[PDB]
Write a protein that binds this ligand. Structure first.
Ligand SMILES: [Zn+2]
Lengths: 54, 124, 106, 339, 40, 48
């Protein structure tokens, strides 16, 4: 869900979606942190009906 | 909702699964669950869960001195660093957190010697 | 001055003393633990070999082992360790599950 | 040597139902497959004599494998090498600057690693077969290995000897004990008697401490010794005859016993005296008849084995000439008749 | 201190299983029945 | 070749100098942790 490469040639510090139910990318942004550095921000949304167990 | 299968992330020290769903690890059969399974007499379930599914391993111990030995079938190593010619290695089923536990006791200058069960023989 | 392994002497080997059949004191009925263990061991060993004298055909090791226990064809013996003498003996009772009472395993 | 040893092991059975259809045959097969040709408990296993004592096939309890295990006490023919023994054949395979590596040929698989000294690297080469002398307890039997590592020295027969002062009699039951060694010597002699006279004679001439001007060193049937100008006023005594007489208790074994280098090491002869008149450089050792007899019998067996193995290895004179350089290196260490 | 292994906690800390319940009695293979009923 | 065994008892003792010098497989000599990718030989991270 977020690609990420790192110069040392490269090692893959990528991010995987480890949840049982599929989500949908609602909104993604590239803002600046406190030290003025770009970081990845992903919002994941779920369509939740009432279901057995709620 | 949560479910794991036979494999996944493992703790570096103890060799057991990680802690729960957040870490993609396993769930816990705590102290009180072993009390219940011991009360039921279910010992082959305790092997399956606490050994075959948590952190079971094989420990090698020399008969003649009770100390851990070094055994490797492929790339043949059969040696004890305490006898070196009187080595009599028997494999005991253990689990990694217990071997870590005995090394933590030896690191504090308390020596742990394991007396193995003796050989038994029919007469004549 | 020495190591602990110096004075360590391994436990001496034992002789298996078998109580004769007429002086056995334990029950001639399998406990539920003993029947469960016999069926478990036999089922795993059927998962290894598959050779059995059971006349009817089953598709599971567990069913074969259960019917072998029930029909008295299970090729195992039950060793009940009574005592370990400090002179170096192991007094045990050998019980043949083909000739014992089988508990209620519903 | 070669003798019997009783071992204890625990075998894992991966298929108990099949294994128990014939326990004796399967047990012999597995013992042979695991232990034959390997080092185990300070010994090297040659053959499996039999299974003395076994246990039932227990089912393993600490795992759900359904597998079995069986405790076995078995008797095996093994070969234990003694300190400072004498091998007759080794093929040097590695000749480096640091160490020399060779392997025994006649005896059981043995690796001999001679530490390289400056006087050794310029003589021994790859392809040569030489006799070696061992060292004290350097024959470590590291378990699981197919050979017995031992450091050794290129053999040159010594010029010294030992003297044993015995003050206790050789009893009858200890003579019964040494009967095995006497019988071993008898078998070694009857095995040597088949060989060609020239090979045994030349090897004896090479490895005799002194030199003798031919045809004066060997009387196979009687062992009368070398006829050199009657050096000693007392005839050397046959060890076998003395033991057979002490079986019937007709002679006494007290006094000073010595085997000077002039004596033939492979013969059963030795010197006994009531007073210490041996020209030894070392003090005589006060000991009983048991120790002295054991040491002398073991030396006789070792030297008979050495001569037998030398004669077996070099069946042709071409190889003798190929190894003649070692023969002369031995020869220059001999002592002449300047006495 | 020599600590014989018995009970629950002593075998559990040593990585083994208690000799209890299904593991109280030892099972051995019936040789005399297998040599006369099975084949290799 | 290693037969099946079970621990029957555990003996507790005090470990001395000889026990450490006979059980230990190597001696820590340097304070270098890593020479390269592999751990430094003789340090506290040695592969022995
Ligand atoms: Zn040891």
């Amino acid at each position: 869900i977020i690609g990420k490469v790192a110069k040392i040639k490269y090692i893959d510090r990528s991010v995987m979606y480890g949840f049982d139910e599929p989500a949908v990318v609602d909104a993604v942004m590239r803002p600046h942190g406190p030290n003025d550095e770009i970081f990845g921000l992903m919002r994941l949304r779920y369509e939740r009906n009432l279901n057995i167990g709620d | 909702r949560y479910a794991v299968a036979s494999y996944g992330p493992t703790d570096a020290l103890t060799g057991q699964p990680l802690d729960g769903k957040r870490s993609h690890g396993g769930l816990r059969l705590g102290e009180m669950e072993h009390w219940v399974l011991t009360a039921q007499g279910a010992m082959q379930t305790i092997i399956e869960k606490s050994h075959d599914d948590s952190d079971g391993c094989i420990s090698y111990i020399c008969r003649n001195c009770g100390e851990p030995a070094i055994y490797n079938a492929s790339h043949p190593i059969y040696k004890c660093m305490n006898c070196d010619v009187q080595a009599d290695i028997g494999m005991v089923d253990s689990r990694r957190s217990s071997i870590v536990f005995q090394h933590e006791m030896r690191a504090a200058n308390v020596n742990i010697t394991s007396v193995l069960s003796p050989r038994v023989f029919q007469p004549a | 001055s020495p190591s602990i392994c110096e004075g360590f002497v391994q436990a001496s080997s034992q002789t298996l003393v078998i109580i004769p059949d007429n002086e056995r004191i334990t029950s001639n009925v399998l406990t539920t633990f003993e029947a469960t263990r016999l069926v478990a061991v036999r089922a795993q060993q059927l998962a290894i070999n598959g050779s059995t004298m059971l006349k009817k055909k089953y598709s599971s090791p567990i069913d074969i082992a259960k019917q072998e226990l029930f029909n008295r064809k299970i090729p195992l013996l039950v060793m009940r360790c009574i005592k370990v003498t400090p002179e170096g003996q192991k007094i045990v009772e050998i019980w043949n599950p083909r000739e014992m009472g089988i508990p209620l395993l519903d | 040597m070669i003798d019997q040893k009783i071992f204890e092991t625990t075998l894992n059975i991966d298929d108990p139902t099949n294994f128990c259809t014939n326990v004796e045959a399967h047990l012999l097969k597995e013992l042979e497959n695991i232990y034959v040709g390997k080092c185990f408990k300070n010994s090297f296993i040659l053959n499996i004599t039999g299974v003395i004592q076994r246990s039932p096939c227990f089912i393993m309890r600490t795992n759900n494998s359904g597998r079995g295990y069986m405790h076995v006490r078995f008797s095996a023919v093994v070969s234990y090498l003694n300190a400072f023994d004498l091998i007759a054949a080794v093929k040097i395979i590695k000749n480096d600057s640091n160490i020399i590596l060779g392997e025994s040929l006649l005896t059981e698989p043995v690796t001999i690693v001679i530490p390289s000294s400056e006087s050794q690297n310029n003589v021994a080469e790859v392809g040569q077969i030489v006799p070696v002398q061992l060292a004290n307890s350097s024959v470590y039997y590291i378990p699981g290995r197919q050979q017995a590592s031992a450091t050794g020295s290129i053999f040159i027969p010594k010029h010294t000897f030992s003297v044993y002062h015995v003050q206790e009699e050789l009893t009858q039951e200890q003579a019964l004990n040494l009967t095995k060694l006497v019988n071993i010597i008898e078998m070694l002699l009857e095995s040597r008697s088949k060989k060609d006279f020239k090979q045994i004679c030349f090897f004896e001439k090479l490895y005799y401490t002194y030199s003798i001007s031919s045809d004066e060193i060997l009387d196979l049937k009687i062992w009368k010794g070398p006829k050199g100008k009657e050096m000693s006023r007392l005839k050397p005594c046959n060890v076998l005859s003395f033991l057979y007489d002490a079986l019937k208790n007709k002679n006494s074994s007290l006094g000073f016993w010595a085997r000077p280098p002039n004596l033939l090491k492979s013969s059963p002869l030795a010197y006994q005296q009531d007073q210490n008149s041996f020209n030894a450089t070392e003090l005589p050792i006060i000991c009983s008849a048991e120790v002295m007899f054991v040491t002398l019998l073991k030396e006789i067996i070792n030297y008979l084995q050495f001569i037998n193995d030398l004669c077996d290895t070099f069946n042709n004179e071409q190889l003798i000439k190929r190894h003649e350089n070692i023969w002369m290196l031995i020869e220059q260490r001999k002592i002449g008749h300047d006495f | 201190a020599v600590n014989p292994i018995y009970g629950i906690a002593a075998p559990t800390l040593m990585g083994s299983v208690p000799r209890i319940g299904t593991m109280y009695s030892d099972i051995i293979m019936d040789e005399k029945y297998i040599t006369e009923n099975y084949k290799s | 070749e290693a037969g099946y065994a079970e621990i029957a008892a555990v003996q507790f003792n005090i470990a001395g100098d000889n026990d450490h010098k006979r059980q230990g497989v190597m001696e820590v000599t340097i304070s270098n942790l890593f020479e390269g990718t592999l751990p430094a030989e003789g340090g506290i991270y040695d592969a022995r």
